[PDB]
Every structure is written in C-alpha cells, then in structure tokens.
Design a protein around this ligand. Structure first.
Ligand SMILES: Nc1ncnc2c1ncn2[C@@H]1O[C@H](COP(=O)(O)OP(=O)(O)OP(=O)(O)O)[C@@H](O)[C@H]1O
Ligand SMILES: Nc1ncnc2c1ncn2[C@@H]1O[C@H](COP(=O)(O)OP(=O)(O)OP(=O)(O)O)[C@@H](O)[C@H]1O
Ligand SMILES: [Zn+2]
Ligand SMILES: [Zn+2]
Lengths: 135, 362, 96, 145, 48
C-alpha cells in the first residue's frame, strides 16, 4: 500500500498518456515477448513517468437536435390535446349516445386515424427541424 | 349506456390484437397480388398515358379493389399493433423509469445527460398521477420518498414527483362509503391524465416498429395517388424472412468502415482526376463525330464525375474508356496511370468494400 | 489478419489479466471478480504510480518491501512481479 | 428412360454423362453444395428479383428515354415501354453485364436527370452486382467448403 | 493451406519441444525455461 498523488491521477487521465497506453498495450499484446513482457512494461512505466513530468511543466507554469425533437413531440401532442381541450366534443357525443353500432365503430376508427395524422404531423415537423438544423 | 360501448370496444380491441399477425400476412399477400397485376402495365401514346393491358379485361377493377383492401388491412395492422404490443413497450419503459428513479435516483440525485431523447422525455411521466399504469409496483413513489426524502427534503421530493400527503393520513384514519356519480362528464374527462397520455404517445411515436408500420401505411395511402407506390410494400418480405433480414443487416453491421472505405475510394479517384486534369486531357475526347468534340475532363467537376461513374463501373479501369496512348509523348506515364488506377481502385478498394459486406453477413 | 489481431488483442485484454496472467474465470466466481482483480489488486496504473512513488521517496525512508523492490529494479530483475499467482491463490485454503 | 429415348433421338445419350457426377465423390459434393443451402439460395434470388423489380419500377416511371436500343433511327426499339419487357431486360441484360444497367442503357450526359440517373446506375451496380450476386456465389462456395 | 501448414510447423516448433513433446508452458515457469530446455537438456544437435 502506497500513496498516489491526485496530480499523478490527472496526468494519467490526460489524453496523451491515454494514446501512449493504447500504443503500448497494442504493441505488447500483439508482439511483445513473453520473457521481455515485464522489461517492456517497466520501460513504458519510465517513459510515461517522464511524459507526465513533461505534461505538468507544459500545462502549469446533438443536444440541439434533442431539443428540437422534444419540442416537436410537445407541440404535436398538445395539438391533439387541443381537440379534448376545446370541450366541444361533448355536444357531438350527445348525438352519438343515441345512435347505432356502425357509427360508434366509425368514431372508434376515427380516433385512431386522428392519432396517425398526429404522428404524421410529428414526423414532418421533425424533418423540418432537421432541415433548419443542417441549414 | 356506456357499459355496452366499452364491452364492444374491448371485443374489437381483442379481435385486432388476436389477428394482428394474420392481417400482416394478408397485407403481404395483397402486396404480391397488386404488384403482380402491375406487371402488365404499359404506356399508351404531349403527356403520355399509362393503361393496363390484358386479354381478360377484369384486371382494372381488381386493381382498385386490391388497393382499397390493402389500405384497410394496413390500418387494421397499425390498430392491432397498438392493441397488442404497445402495452408491453409502455410496461417496459415505465418499469425501467421506476428502476432508475428509485435505485440510483436518475431524477433526484443525478440528472440525465441531456443528449439522450429517452431520459429527457421520461421527465414528464414522473409528475403524472397515472404512473405505474402498467407497472405492478404502485408504491415506487413511497419507496423513493422513504429512501431519499430526508436527504433532499420531504415536501420538495413530494412536489418533484407530484405527490399528496393528506390522502395517506385520511385513508389510514376513519373513512365512510358513499356511492359515486358515473355520469360526471367533467370528472371522467379530468381523470384522464393528459400529461401521461402525452408521455405515452411520445413513447409510441419514438418506438421503431410503430414507425415502420406507419411508413407502411403511408406507402399504402400514396399507392392510391400513384399505383406504382405499392411496389415499396414488397420490401416487407425482407423483414419477414430471417435470411433477408440478416442480408440487410450486413450492410449496417459495418457501416462506419463501409463509409470510411467509400471516402477513401472517393479521395483516390479524386487524386487520379486531379492528375488527369493537369497532364492527360487530350485523351478524354468522347465524341465520334469530329465536328463536335465532347471533352469529359475540361472541367474539374465533370472530370471527377466521369472518373467516379464510367471509370469505376468499367472492369478494366479508366483506360478502357479513355483514348489509346500509343505514339504519344506521355505513353509510359499514362500506362502507369491506368495500371495504378486498375490496381488500386478496381482490384483492391472495391474488393475491400465487397469483402466487408460479405464477411459481415458471414 | 490485421483486423483479427486487433480483435484478438482486445479479447485477450478483456479476458486475461495482464500482470499475473490468470484467467478471468478463476476470478469471476464472485460477481465482478475480474473487474475487482483488475482494479483493486492488479492495476497497471497502480504499478506505474508505485514506481513513481519509489522514485520520489528518499532512500533512507523506504520500508522493507520498498527497499526490496528498489534493489530488485536497480538490478533489473522482475521476480517481484506476480507470475501466475495472486493473493487468493497464495492464501486460498485460509481465505476460503 | 434416357437410354430408350436415345434411340428416338441420338442426342438424348448426352444426359448419361451426368452419371460421373454421381460416380465421383468430389463431383457429388459439388452438386450437393447447391442443395445444401437451398432455402437461403432461393430466398436470396427472390431478394435479387425484388430489388431489380424496384429498379425497373423506378426506370419505367422516370428514365425511359435512355432505353432505346436500336442503331437505325427509323425504327426505335424501346425495351422499357412495357412493364414486363423492362423487367425482363433488367433481369437479363442488366444482371449479366458486369458494370451494371448503365453499361447497356444510353449515356445521361447533358440531360436534366443526369445526377439522378448516375445515382441510379451506381446504386444498381453496388447493390445488385457487387453485393447480392456475391452473396449467392459465397453461399454456394462456402457450402461446398 | 500450404502457407498455413508452414506457419503451423513454425509455431509448433517454437511452442513445443521436438524430443519429449512437453509444452513450453511447463518449462517457462523460470525465465527462458523453454530455451534452456531446448538448448541444454533436449537438443537435436546434441543427440546427433
Ligand atoms: N493488470 C491490469 N490492469 C488493468 N486492466 C487490466 C489488467 N489486466 C487486465 N485488464 C483489463 O484491461 C482493460 C483496461 O481497462 P479499459 O481498457 O477498459 O480502460 P481504458 O484504458 O480507459 O479504455 P476503454 O475504457 O476505452 O476501453 C480492462 O478490461 C481490464 O479488465
Ligand atoms: N529438441 C529440440 N532441440 C532443438 N530445438 C528445439 C527442440 N525442441 C524445440 N526446439 C525449438 O526449435 C527451434 C530450433 O532452433 P532455431 O530454429 O531457432 O535455430 P536454427 O536452426 O539456427 O534456425 P533459425 O535461427 O533460422 O530459426 C527453437 O525455437 C527451439 O526452441
Ligand atoms: Zn492479475
Ligand atoms: Zn524436450
């Protein structure tokens, strides 16, 4: 058990050391000699330590698309919710309560057709927002 | 007076859910029928008119009947999917929402990374009263309250998830029984959590299979405006059969490498076009008549387009198309140019692309 | 073959531990066993920071283990590196 | 039966040369390679026929002026005036051609639909010739292997 | 296949000992264990 410095952790997490470790791991696993595995690892440790000490000296001396998609969903679903918020469907349903099976099935189909048109409006709005993004 | 309409709606709901697959089967059969009838569709001759030609003469009304039947069956397929598989997707999504909300507090302790559509859209459902509508655990709200409230403020967590405190105490205390009013239209409509329905419709719209079935219905509708739009429905077999599905998925399996290799090919053919536009331009005449010389490499864009199209498709290479170099001062240079084009572009890079696709399938 | 070698490197790295060389199956008896072995017990970053710590520390203050490893590294012998054995293998009967 | 029919027509005796394909083990394996993956081979051929059908449907609607195949100007020979004729031509002369359908149909230079037809021909070459035919050939060869 | 057989011959020769047939892993417990086994202990030149 020993002590690791937070500065050492940061310089390990620096991208240059990450790239160096990529190259060393690839080289050792692909062709590093088994008898020389530890020797190469210690050499890489020394090189990385020097690179860390150099990096210290050198250093110290999409989302908008998701925004648009969320807004498109909100607006296009609130557009359909306006149908219920108008509250005028009650007067029309007053008529349907006394009529027949064919017409009740017709309203049943009309609901899903309205949902499908809402989906079409949503996807069209998504495309339009994407055109505005790319342009 | 509504106990009958709900029963009949349930019967239709269950019928569509039960026969969802059979309707999808019938739609594909009708798709083969329409496209087989369309195989005898000739031009007749200003605007040109397209007329069905047949000896029987009953093909024309059949083409309308089949189109209407396909349009109805497709709509029934979307309805059946909504009856059958949408509740499963909602139940799942609602279950992982509760999992993240409770176990690691993805809306109390830590916030979504804002680059994922799912995490951003799931913020809406927690406020809705009609939560675990499909999920079994109806007390995830209570669990999150007991496990995080003291740390983050009881009343603040209560407002974040939209709870109420007086209801628990009242239910634990004494209560009375009072008959309700089923006729209350305002109460019935307000009981419908419009926010929760908004969230559920968002989930359904984001679902991929629902998008596929909506595209299918859109092509079915457009087939009425133009009968040839029904040909896109023959791609449904590529989804139905597993081998065709794997063949299509082979292309997307290595999409990044396939895009990068195509870019490399476009860069190589661009360098070759740059060399040709500077040195070898007299060899690109492509007109047999001597009066009008048709040069395909006078312009940079034209030369690049010609190299991309006629050079890549040709098996031998660009030298199969451009004019012979015998006797010219640049004979050896153009010979090396054509040989290197053939080796690098046709022999190697195209083989790399083909091998990528084939071995992805394998 | 080049792509296969890259894939084999990544698979070997995910299934083997680089230092001791023991298989991940021997560690995965407990949940996250291989991850715990590769993070807490045998970690390349920890070994590198150990080398830095011994370089930075003064000779007179090295402990017994630190002086042992320091002499071992000065004479450039790598016996101190675990070879096929770990703490669990060393104390298998007593620990389990 | 072939031996008997050979008396009515002597050329019927040529079918008896297929008996070596049964006699020798390697030829037997070569023949069994085709039937080894019969379901996948039928499905892939159906996919190819669907893809070339979609391409023919696009051509019959948009690119028809480019399908004249007669050198003499007096008699224009159109291979894509009819749906069936265009599909047959795409199945035969387009599939056999190594470059694709654009090796056979007329050049698009200077036309308003130049880029559209260029994309059409390039996609035909990529999807039909490069990929699907390679899939069929690989299926047969690796079944043998 | 011919190239693969040549490569397999070379790999078998580098990883196996020709005389006893024991794996190089059993010898490589010590550093250069397989080399020491193939040079000092079991060597074709020494047998010849
Ligand atoms: N001695 C070891 N020290 C560290 N990791 C080891 C060791 N032996 C095996 N490994 C494995 O090597 C890998 C190293 O970690 P990993 O590559 O995941 O992190 P990284 O370097 O940040 O790269 P990335 O997260 O992009 O893959 C892990 O899968 C780990 O289990
Ligand atoms: N019984 C054995 N005797 C000798 N070498 C053996 C034996 N068993 C296995 N080997 C291995 O066979 C190889 C023979 O030595 P090696 O081929 O390296 O030498 P060489 O004949 O001079 O050829 P080169 O050095 O060009 O490869 C070594 O890798 C050695 O470890
Ligand atoms: Zn280890
Ligand atoms: Zn031996």
């Amino acid at each position: 058990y020993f002590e690791i410095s937070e500065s050492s952790r940061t310089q390990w997490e620096k991208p240059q050391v990450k790239e160096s470790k990529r190259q060393f791991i690839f080289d050792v696993v692909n062709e590093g000699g088994e008898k020389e595995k530890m020797e190469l690892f210690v050499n890489f440790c020394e090189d990385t330590i020097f690179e860390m000490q150099l990096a210290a000296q050198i250093s110290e001396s999409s989302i908008l698309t998701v925004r648009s998609a969320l807004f498109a969903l909100r607006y296009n679903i609130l557009t359909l919710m306006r149908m219920l918020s108008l509250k005028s469907l009650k007067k029309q349903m007053k008529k349907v309560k006394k009529m027949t099976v064919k017409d009740m099935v017709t309203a049943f189909f009309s609901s899903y057709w309205s949902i499908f048109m809402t989906l079409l409006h949503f996807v069209a709005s998504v495309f339009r927002g994407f055109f505005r993004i790319i342009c | 007076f509504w106990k009958k309409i709900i029963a009949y709606q349930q019967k239709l709901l269950n019928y569509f859910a039960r026969n969802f697959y059979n309707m999808r089967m019938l739609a594909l059969f009708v798709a083969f029928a329409i496209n087989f009838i369309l195989l005898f569709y000739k031009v007749s001759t200003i605007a040109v008119h397209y007329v069905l030609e047949e000896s029987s003469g009953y093909m024309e009304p059949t083409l309308r009947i089949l189109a209407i039947l396909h349009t109805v069956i497709s709509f029934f397929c979307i309805i059946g999917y909504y009856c059958l598989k949408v509740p499963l997707v909602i139940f799942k999504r609602e279950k992982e929402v509760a999992r993240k909300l409770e176990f690691d507090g993805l809306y109390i302790t830590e916030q979504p990374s804002e680059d994922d559509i799912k995490g951003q859209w799931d913020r809406l459902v927690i406020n809705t009263q009609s939560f675990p509508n499909n999920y079994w655990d109806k007390f995830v709200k209570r669990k999150v309250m007991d496990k995080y409230g003291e740390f983050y403020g009881r009343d603040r967590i209560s407002e974040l998830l939209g709870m109420d405190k007086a209801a628990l105490d009242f239910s634990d205390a004494r209560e009375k029984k009072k008959p309700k009013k089923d006729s209350s239209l305002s109460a019935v409509l307000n009981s419908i959590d419009v926010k929760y329905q908004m969230w559920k419709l968002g989930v359904v719209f984001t679902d991929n299979s629902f998008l596929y079935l909506a595209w299918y219905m859109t092509m079915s509708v457009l087939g009425h405006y133009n009968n040839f739009f029904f040909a896109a429905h023959l791609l449904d077999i590529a989804m139905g059969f597993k081998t065709l599905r794997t063949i299509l998925s082979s292309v997307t399996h290595n999409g990044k490498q396939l895009v990068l290799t195509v870019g490399l090919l476009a860069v190589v053919v661009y360098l070759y076009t740059v060399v040709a536009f500077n040195f070898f331009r007299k060899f690109y005449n492509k007109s047999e008549d001597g009066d009008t010389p048709d040069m395909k490499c006078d312009d940079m864009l034209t030369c690049y387009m010609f190299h991309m199209y006629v050079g890549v498709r040709a098996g031998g290479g660009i030298g199969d198309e451009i004019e012979d170099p015998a006797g010219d001062e640049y004979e050896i240079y153009r010979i090396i140019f054509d040989i290197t084009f053939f080796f690098f572009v046709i022999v190697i890079l195209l083989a790399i692309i083909q091998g990528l696709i084939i071995d992805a399938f394998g | 073959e080049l792509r296969d070698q890259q894939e084999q490197v990544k698979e070997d790295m995910e299934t083997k531990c680089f230092i001791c060389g023991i298989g991940n199956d021997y560690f995965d008896t407990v949940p996250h066993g291989f991850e715990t072995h590769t993070l807490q017990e045998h970690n390349l970053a920890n070994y590198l920071f150990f080398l830095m710590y011994l370089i930075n520390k003064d000779e007179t203050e090295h402990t017994g283990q630190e002086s042992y490893v320091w002499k071992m590294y000065q004479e450039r012998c790598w016996e101190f590196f675990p070879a096929g054995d770990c703490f669990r293998k060393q104390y298998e009967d007593q620990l389990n």
